[PDB]
Design a binder for this molecule. Sequence first.
Ligand SMILES: *[C@@H]1O[C@H](CO)[C@@H](O[C@@H]2O[C@H](CO)[C@@H](O)[C@H](O)[C@H]2NC(C)=O)[C@H](O)[C@H]1NC(C)=O
Ligand SMILES: *[C@@H]1O[C@H](CO)[C@@H](O)[C@H](O)[C@H]1NC(C)=O
Ligand SMILES: *[C@@H]1O[C@H](CO)[C@@H](O)[C@H](O)[C@H]1NC(C)=O
Lengths: 56, 56, 56, 168
Amino acid sequence: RLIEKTNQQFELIDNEFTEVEKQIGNVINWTRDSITEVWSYNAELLVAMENQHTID
Amino acid sequence: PRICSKGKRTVDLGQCGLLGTITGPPQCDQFLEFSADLIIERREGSDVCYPGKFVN
Amino acid sequence: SPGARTQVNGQSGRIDFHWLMLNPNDTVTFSFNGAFIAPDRASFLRGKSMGIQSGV
Amino acid sequence: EEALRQILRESGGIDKEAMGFTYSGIRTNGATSSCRRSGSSFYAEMKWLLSNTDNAAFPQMTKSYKNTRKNPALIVWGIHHSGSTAEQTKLYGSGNKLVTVGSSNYQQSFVPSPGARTQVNGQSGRIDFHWLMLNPNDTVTFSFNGAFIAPDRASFLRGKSMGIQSGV
Ligand SMILES: *[C@@H]1O[C@H](CO)[C@@H](O[C@@H]2O[C@H](CO)[C@@H](O)[C@H](O)[C@H]2NC(C)=O)[C@H](O)[C@H]1NC(C)=O
Ligand SMILES: *[C@@H]1O[C@H](CO)[C@@H](O)[C@H](O)[C@H]1NC(C)=O
Ligand SMILES: *[C@@H]1O[C@H](CO)[C@@H](O)[C@H](O)[C@H]1NC(C)=O
């Protein structure tokens, strides 16, 4: 169940070599930090759940 | 540490940019009518030969 | 806008490229009095793909 | 304004380096009643460029600044829109005015627009401020014919920080 990754295809939205406008760049950075905070919390919660469920 | 691409067409734009494929500098002569399923941009790629930029 | 700028690539004059995405049947008109860089050929998209940026 | 506000929120402070910019013939002091340090004054960090006398020709000048430090530079200039075309002929003289700003990755054209507006702070004329973030070694060029508010000093970022808005 867990090992399978996604099939959604993600594009580049930021040019690392040349900077994007600074307003939409800050919006993109804030959205990416919020998304990775959500995914980090989900990862920690999922690891704790499956470890506890394996022991039980 | 190297881009894996097996069975997908690959264009490596050394010294060329994506926006240069439309306008055609001397550095982008090979990729005027390019076709790929995976396009790679480099840091050394320059879009223009005469000084200038692309709006949007 | 004629005016003195900094020297990049030995040229003080500069150029701006603007783009539009014409519709499967739309007529574009270029009424110019000068300072125009006309396109030789149009550009048409081929399919789908992905674009990455790397230095490897 | 919002991108510059975000930059100044994580600026950590601003460091000022003297942009030399010597002017000949024309006045460079500027005077308005709305903006008062004491009596009549203008911005401390910007210089108003007028003609030597009223209804006189404004010479075309090109001024260039070079960046020498290892950090990006913040360059802020201004474009003055007169409250009337008669006021623009009084301040800068007759003829069309054009300001061209040049850089390696920045280029933009400004034309002042004389016209009547509403009265805010007792002045009908209005002023735009435009900004660029110069690169650790990029040369900015200010070729102007008039209606230009030149920066006295550049701005350099200091560190990191945060910016909050509150009323307590
Ligand atoms: C958004 O975040 C990225 C990092 O995720 C920032 O990119 C860095 O920018 C600094 C200069 O400010 C460079 O020294 C780094 O090399 C960049 N890192 C990467 C991975 O590109 C970007 O500047 C941020 N955007 C804004 C508007 O703050
Ligand atoms: C469609 O293309 C034709 C010729 O290629 C042109 O004459 C016609 O005006 C175009 N139609 C529109 C709606 O732009
Ligand atoms: C870059 O910095 C050097 C420092 O010596 C300076 O002379 C130069 O004018 C600056 N401007 C350029 C060329 O971008």
